[PDB]
Amino acid sequence: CGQTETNLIPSHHYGKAFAPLFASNAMFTRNQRAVITREAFVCARSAVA
Amino acid sequence: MAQRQFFGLTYNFYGQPAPLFDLNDLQELAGCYARPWTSRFSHLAISTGSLPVWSARYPSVASRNIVVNTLLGAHLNPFAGGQITSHQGITWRDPVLSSLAPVPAIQPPPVWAVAENVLLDSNNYPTYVLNLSSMWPINQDVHIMTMWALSDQGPIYHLEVPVDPMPAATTAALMAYTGVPIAHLAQTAYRFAGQLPQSPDSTMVSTIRWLSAIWFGSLTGRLNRSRTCNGFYFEFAKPALNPDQAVLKWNDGARAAPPAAAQSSYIRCISPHWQHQIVEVAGALMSQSVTAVTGLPALIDEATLPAWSQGVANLTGNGQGVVPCLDYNPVPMAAARHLQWRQDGLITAAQEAQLNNDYTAYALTIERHLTAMLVANPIAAGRMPIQPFNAADFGQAGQTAAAVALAQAMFV
Amino acid sequence: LRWPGLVDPNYRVGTNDLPNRITLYNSLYRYNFTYPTLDGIMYVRSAT
Amino acid sequence: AALPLVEALSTLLRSVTPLVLDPTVLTNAITTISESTTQTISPISEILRLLQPMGNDYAAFWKCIASWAYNGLVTTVLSEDAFPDSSQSITHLPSMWKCLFLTLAGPMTSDPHSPVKVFMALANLLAQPEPIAIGVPGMHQTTPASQFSHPGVWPPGFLNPQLINPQQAPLLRAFAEHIRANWPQPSEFGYGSTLQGSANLFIPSNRMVYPWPNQPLPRLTVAPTYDSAMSNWISTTIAFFIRVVNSVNMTATVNDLTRRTMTGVMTAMRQVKTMTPFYIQHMCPTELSVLASVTVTPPFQVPFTRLVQNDVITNVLVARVDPAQRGDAAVDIRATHATFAAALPVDPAAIVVAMLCGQTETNLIPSHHYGKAFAPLFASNAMFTRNQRAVITREAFVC
Amino acid sequence: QRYTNPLVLGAAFGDFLNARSIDIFLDRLFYDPTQDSPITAITKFPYQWTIDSNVTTDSVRTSAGCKYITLYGYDPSRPSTPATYGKHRPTYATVFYYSTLPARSRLL
Amino acid sequence: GRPELLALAYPGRAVLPTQTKNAQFLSTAIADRIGRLDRANLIGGEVSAMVECMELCDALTLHIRETYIMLLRSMHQDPTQIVQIVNECANNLLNSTIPISLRPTILCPWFASSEDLRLQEVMHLVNISSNTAAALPLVEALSTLLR
Incomplete structure (x- = not known):
């Protein structure tokens, strides 16, 4: 029992629907974390050595 | 894109029994480092000509350039060998060449291939060609190698001015970078080009190439405040001591005369001084990136080339693009x-x-x-952390003025 | 030796001093860089 | 700085202008015809909503037209909140009217780029029925018109529509040809007198420029004065739309007969005997000329080029030191502008209503009218005292 | 004198055979082989018989050219039969054509 | 604030009342190199991108700070490329306004190589101690988002 809407226009629908989602800049901030991660790994190694 | 016969040329030795470094120097390299990727090297280079280029191991930036190549040259012969070799210091951290490893324990059988002065074809080695994606970042590095190593001079740098269809998008972006020295632009570029297994998307590519011209054009004289590439020239900041730092500058004077269609040069520097000239070097690193994308006219014909680097595969010829190199x-x-x-x-x-x-x-x-x-x-x-070269090499000759004149006519 | 450039006119204040001596007076580079949001750099088109 | 200058002129010129804007004529047209008892839901209402029959601000209308003539630095643009989001497809009745709107208001922008816009808004709604043959790498089927802010982007396929095979994009080919053929052509008016010339730089002092083609005043009492560039444009746009819709295949999930309805409305538009094309291409330039020389700040203009991409308005410079032997011109003002020249966004709705609903007076005696319009005005002139100012300013600079 | 597009042809009869729309294809049926440019107008088109790279700048897929069409009586594995290898299946092989060398490379 | 600091930052500023050991030194050194030799902007009506000033400054510390900056610079991305990233991610469904403007020294170090994301990922994976249920809240949450 799978149904959609009566006046479905996906193009349109998706435009609206997805819109707020990609307003969350938080994605990019993840990146920055990951580089320090890497950096810490490396640093740890060389010091302990 | 995958230029199948990605054959790269390892450096010769200056009448030496051994490749150019001693064991201690190579130890330094391999060991005190880890990744086979230029991050570390670029770190040094980037620091906008402030730090003295001198050290106990590393005399210049260019020094390091050379031992980087030789390092490469030696340690590739291992894994790029016919049936896989690797020991004495380097036994590769995984087949996929992940990291410079000090000999894994129970792993002797892959010898240390004692090679002489030898070009290799990356794609002829099954491991190498399997890993075409991961191959891509290192090929970039490879070129850098080859294109110093080919000769006994300062780097063989390539130039390109595609005239007429010029992307409006390129213009727009590029303007935002106004204020920065060539160095940092280069750095970002290389980083991108490596980070993404290289694209046919000429965007990047075009941009670097234009940049290279504008710099070169600037450096010559052709390009300046009043004669611009639409606004583009490079400004040589601080008119006293020789550190006259080429920043990208946009000023509207004139739009210089659009050349006939496609203008190509290659420059080399005959004089060891290249070593302390980050400008010169940074163009050469630019032209390498270019290479990865593009099948440049079969390399500077053997006429100006030492005997060991004659008759190379599909590289030097006689009746191709750019038979003679422009020399200064x-x-x-x-x-x-x-x-x-x-x-x-x-x-x-x-x-x-x-x-x-x-x-x-x-x-x-x-x-x-x-x-x-x-x-x-x-x-x-027994150790060599430096370019080999005689006092007579410093000579004010080497086709210096011709180069200049050619560069100029190119701009017509 | 602490201020090679200031002392002595010879020295263009960025010469390889390491690891010998820590210089105490030289060209300092200071910079003016804004941090703009990623959402700010570009204009939106809400009409999606 | 800009706004007092604009407001000022547009206010005065209002007063000066013997015009009867008549939105009421549209009001009656719609009421009378709308398939059925005009109280229907979804077609006939949408038209009403977008145009707003109420039109509680007759000033804005005329103002917006006047504003085209300004042209110095402060250039006028089609506002963004007019374009269909997400491209959409021409299926949409709503969208139909919108593009119609956009297109007729288009050439009354200072914006050079407006032909690219015109084209591109249609190409956006043509997406999905047809694959649009990409012309620039940057330029996609999806790339909003808003983002086409530089001459660098004028599609090769626009510039040579001949290239575009008139089977797959039949409508697009037509629309493009229609542009290039019938978009207003550039002309010139006579600015002032030799006492000062004018405050123009690029254009000989003697000249105003009318991107619209200005015509003489003979006996204009020849009610179908449709030979005007302006009126031609109107028709041909409407025409192309008819063409577009004539096939009616595109109306999946809209079970009510569009063609009837839309033809009726459009023909409605066309039937409205409006003088505004005439008055604007004839009477108004004059109007403007008369004022130009006396104004506080005299009109400053650059040659409008329709389709000549290489000659289009691109950059505006300054340099207190010798261009050649100066310094690499640091902050220059120049660079502050997002465009070729500092732009102001306008309303397509309004300009549309005013084009279609702008009539001339019963008791129209030009010679009488303009005499009375000029006289109070010129009485309060500043002309001579500004000439003084000027000479002073000059001497200040030099000293 | 006008030449035909083989793929479209194939496609046409096959769909027809399997009670499907064929008329839609006819606008590009007339094709001269001399000019190897499907790219021009196949900007989308179908994703049915063809899996074209939208403008098809890289490649054009064609429908699974199946060969040994089994007959009635042959359902049980028999040693004294021809090697059909069941190449009469949906699940076959993508018949990928490519314009040029860099097209080929990017496909890979 | 604090005029003090200037003195210390710029020895050379000082006048000579005595014929003393310190004086002697100062009077044998190259004076002109005090403060700002060059300022770096060309954009007319905007402030400077950098200053080039002879200052009381610690080479080692400088070096540290220099490096850091070079690291930051490497990660920094220009408008166009940012546009790309978003457009691609958007799969043209979603739409952003591409500006035609000169680039005003734009500091956004956000871009990181896969490499790092990869090691973050693994790190993440490793910290999921032994019980199967830990995955569930996350996957649950994604299902609600999806719904």
């Missing part, structure tokens, strides 16, 4: 540039031209003496 001695060029400038009446020679020629004369002297004095050590010990 850096200090005479600065003079050349001032010439043009004065010929145009941009400026009085009076004080401007005199002064800077005075300073570059000084800078020559300093450089020459340091490079010689440093070379003395390798030219007595």
Whole structure:
């Protein structure tokens, strides 16, 4: 029992629907974390050595 | 994109039984480092000519450039060998070449391939070609190698000015970077080009190429405040001592005469001074990136080339693109540039031209003496962390003025 | 030796001093860089 | 700085202008015809909503037209909140009217780029029925018109529509040809007198420029004065739309007969005997000329080029030092502008209503009218005292 | 004198055979082989018989050219039969054509 | 604030009342190199991108700070490329306004190589101690988002 809407226009629908989602800049901030991660790994190694 | 016969050329040795480094130096390298990727090297290079380029191991940036190549050259012969070799220091951290490993324990069987002066074809090695994606970042590095190693001079740098269809998008973006020195732009570029397994998307590609021209054009004289590439030239900041840092500058004077269609040169520097000229070097690193994308006219014909680097595969020829290389001695060029400038009446020679020629004369002297004095050590010990080269090499010749004139006519 | 450039006119204040001596007076580079949001750099088109 | 200058002129010129804007004529047209008892839901209402029959601000209308003539630095643009989001497809009745709107208001922008816009808004709604043959790498089927802010982007396929095979994009080919053929052509008016010339730089002092083609005043009492560039444009746009819709295949899930309805409305538009094309291409330039020389700040203009991409308005410079022998011109003002020249966004709705609903007076005696319009006005002139100012300012600079 | 597009042809009869729309294809049926440019107008088109790279700048897929069409009686594995290898299946092989060398490379 | 600091930052500023050991030194050194030799902007009506000033400054510390900056610079991305990233991610469904403007020294170090994301990922994976249920809240949450 799978149904959609009566006046479905996906193009349109998706435009609206997805819109707020990609307003969350938080994605990019993840990146920055990951580089320090890497950096810490490396640093740890060389010091302990 | 996958230029199948990605054949790269490892460096010769200066009448040496061994590749150019001693064990200690290579230890330094491999060991004190880890990744086979240029991050570490670029770290050093980037620091906008502040830090002295001198060290116990590493005399110049260019020094390191050379031992980077030789390192490569030696340690590839291992895994790129016919049936896989690897020991004495380096036994590769995984087949996929992940990291410079000190010999894994129970792993002797892959010997240390004692090679002489030998080009290799990356794609002929099954491991290498399997890993075409991961191959891509290192090929970039490879080129850098090859294109110093080919010769006994300062780097063989390639130029390109595609005239007419010029992307509007390129313009727009590029303007935002106004204020920065060539160095940092280059750095970002290389980083991108590596980070993404290389794209047919000419965007990046075009951009680098235009940049290279504008720099070169600037450096020559052709390009300046009043004769621009639409606004584009490179400004040589600080007119006293020889550190006259080429920043991308956008000023509207004139739009210089659109050439006929596609203009290509390659430059080399005959004089060891190249070593301390981050400008020169940074163009050469630019032209490498270019290479990864593009199948450049079969390399600078053997006419100006040492015997060991004649008859190379599909690289040197005789009847191709750019048969002769454009050759310069850096200090005479600065003079050349001032010439043009004065010929145009941009400026009085009076004080401007005199002064800077005075300073570059000084800078020559300093450089020459340091490079010689440093070379003395390798030219007595088994170790070589430096470009090999005689005092007669410094000579004010090597087709310096022709280069300049060609560069200029190119701009027509 | 602590201030090679200031002391002595010879020295263009960025010469390889390591690891010998820590210089205490030289060319300092200071910079003016804004941090703009990623959402700010570009204009939106809400009409999606 | 800009706004007092604009407001000022547009206010005065209002007063000066013997016009009867008549939105009421549209009001009656719609009421009378709308398939059925005009109280229907979804077609006939949408038209009403977008145009707003109420039109509680007759000033804005005329103002917006006047504003085209300004042209110095402060250039006028089609506002963004007019374009269909997410491209959409021409299926949409709503969208139909919108593009219609956009297109007729288009050439009354200072914006050079407006032909690219015109084209591109249609190409956006043509997406999905047809694959649009990409012309620039940057330029996609999806790339909003808003983002086409530089001459660098004028599609090769626009510039040579001949290239575009008139089977797959039949409508697009037509629309493009229609542009290039019938978009207003550039002309010139006579500015002032030799006492000062004018405050123009690029254009000989003697000249105003009318990107619209200005015509003489003979006996204009020849009610179908449709030979005007302006009126031609109107028709041909409407025409192309008819063409577009004539096939009616595109009306999946809209079970009510569009063609009837839309033809009726459009023909409605066309039937409205409006003088505004005439008055604007004839009477108004004059109007403007008369004022130009006396104004506080005299009109400053650059040659409008329709389709000549290489000659289009691109950059505006300044340099207190010798261009050649200066310094690499640091902050220059120049660079502050997002465009070729500092732009102001306008309303397509309004300009549309005013084009279609702008009539001339019963008791129209030009010679009488303009005499009375000029006289109070010129009485309060500042002309001579500004000439003084000017000479002073000059001497200040030099000293 | 006008030449035909083989793929479209194939496609046409096959769909027809399997009670499907064929008329839609006819606008590009007339094709001269001399000019190897499907790219021009196949900007989308179908994703049915063809899996074209939208403008098809890289490649054009064609429908699974199946060969050994089994007959009635042959359902049980028999040693004394021809090697059909069941190449009469949906699940076959993508018949990928490519314009040029860099097209080929990017496909890979 | 605090005028003090200037003195210390710029020895050379000082006048000579005595014929003393310190004086002697100062009077044998190259004076002109005090403060700002060059300022770096060309954009007319905007402030400077950088200053080039002879200052009381610690080479080692400088070096540290220099490096850091070079690291930051490497990660920094320009408008155009940012546009790309978003457009691609958007799969043209979603839409952003591409500006035609000169680039005003834009500091956004956000871009990181896969490499790092990869090691973050693994790190993440490793910290999921032994019980199967830990995955569930996350996957649950994604299902609600999806719904």
